[PDB]
């Protein structure tokens, strides 16, 4: 057996599929977006989560084609249900570092946005703070074109890496996403009370939006709301879910 072969097989069989984790406002209300999370519906093993296959996919050279397939499926899934999404609804994708050195990303973003009415969604690209993009004239160009499309850049896993204020201006960052490890420490450890505050301060200084991830408890939610966190994501709000479940919930909220 070849793992690379098997990934190419899975991709050709459209086995990489999107799950959707909702984002809600800091002060509560109806959902304001989703993060798209890849899953592998494997014929024999069931639904495999991405920490089990994305690293291999990155090594193999297949992550870009896999991401493109995911963005195309999301357009197919949600592009015909714009009426269920309040204008400005965020749709976020995790982008691998290789994809950021490829001007093709601009075309993939354009294509996704074309599946919805103009300005109706906000496309967000999430770049992990753990792997800081090495800038070049290509990245300069790419991020300028993405910004001109109206795409937003989020830095996720935030607080776990070592980005600088200069890097945040360089890649035109719109949003920080606080890693779930910091949220998990609310009401338990002082140091991360300080780390979490320090991220909030950085975001107010640079006028960035903040999403807090891993929000599992009301304690956590209230703590984050009291510090002006814009958006919350976590099992308290909603686990990642298949399309049918997302549509069911959106219909309910559309109704209220
Ligand atoms: N226990 C707990 N977990 C929570 C909570 N809130 C969110 N999570 C989980 O944390 C992960 C959030 O995405 P991430 O930090 O980008 O971390 C992601 C991301 O780095 C990567 N990944 C997922 N989808 C893609 C993709 O489309 N492309 C690429 N390149 N990477 C992806 O896989 C990682 C893991 O994804 P998932 O397994 O879907 O796991 C998701 C989500 O289900 C919570 O309250 N409690
Ligand atoms: Mg994704
Ligand atoms: Mg993410
Ligand atoms: Mg994270």
Q: Which residues contact 193 (CB under 8 A, 6 or more apart)?
A: 185, 186
Cα 240 to Cα 37, 39, 163, 195, 215: the distances in Å are 7, 10, 28, 26, 13
- The alpha carbon of 77 and the centre of ligand 2 are apart by a number of angstroms equal to 15
Which CATH number belongs to the domain containing residue 226 in this structure? 3.20.20.450
In this structure, which residues have their CB less than 5 angstroms from ion ligand 2? 36, 93-94
| E strand map for 57-114 | 89-94
Ligand 1 binding pocket mutation candidate from 94, 100, 130, 238 (most atoms within 8 A of CB): 94
Cα 198 to Cα 64, 192, 195, 202: the distances in Å are 34, 9, 5, 6
Closest CA to 177 of 217, 124, 135: 124
Give the ligand at the shortest distance from the Cα of 232: 1
Give the tokens for residue 58. 């990155």
Resolution in A: 1.8
Domain boundaries, position 137: 1-256
Ligand 1 binding pocket mutation candidate from 50, 128, 242 (most atoms within 8 A of CB): 50
Give the tokens for residue 204. 């107010």
| Chain mean position to CA 84 | 20
Number of domains in the chain: 1
- Coil, helix or strand for 58? helix
- The alpha carbon of 150 and the centre of ligand 3 are apart by a number of angstroms equal to 19
Cross-strand pairs, 156: 128
């Amino acid at each position: 057996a070849s793992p690379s072969s098997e990934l190419r097989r899975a991709l050709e069989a459209n086995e990489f599929i999107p799950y959707y984790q909702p984002l809600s406002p800091g002060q509560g209300g109806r959902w304001i977006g989703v993060e798209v999370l890849m899953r592998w519906r494997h014929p024999r093993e069931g639904l495999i989560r991405p920490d089990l296959f994305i690293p291999f996919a990155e090594r193999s050279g297949l992550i870009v084609p896999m991401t493109r397939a995911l963005m195309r499926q999301v357009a197919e899934d949600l592009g015909g249900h714009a009426g269920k999404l309040e204008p400005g609804f965020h749709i976020g994708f995790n982008i691998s570092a290789t994809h950021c050195h490829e001007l093709a990303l601009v075309d993939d973003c354009r294509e996704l946005l074309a599946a919805f009415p103009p300005g109706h969604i906000t496309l967000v690209l999430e770049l992990t703070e753990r792997e800081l993009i090495e800038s070049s004239e290509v990245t300069d160009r790419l991020f300028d074109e993405l910004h001109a499309l109206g795409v937003k850049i989020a830095i996720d896993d935030f607080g776990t890496g070592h980005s600088s204020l200069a890097y945040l201006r360089k890649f035109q960052v719109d949003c920080l996403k606080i890693d779930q490890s910091f949220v998990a420490r609310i009401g338990i450890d002082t140091l991360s009370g300080h780390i979490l505050d320090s991220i909030v301060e950085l975001s107010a200084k640079l006028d960035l939006d903040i999403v807090a991830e891993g929000v599992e408890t009301p304690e956590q939610r209230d703590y984050l709301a009291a510090r002006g966190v814009d958006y919350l994501q976590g099992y308290l709000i909603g686990r990642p879910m298949p399309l049918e479940s997302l549509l069911s919930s959106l219909t309910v909220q559309e109704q209220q």
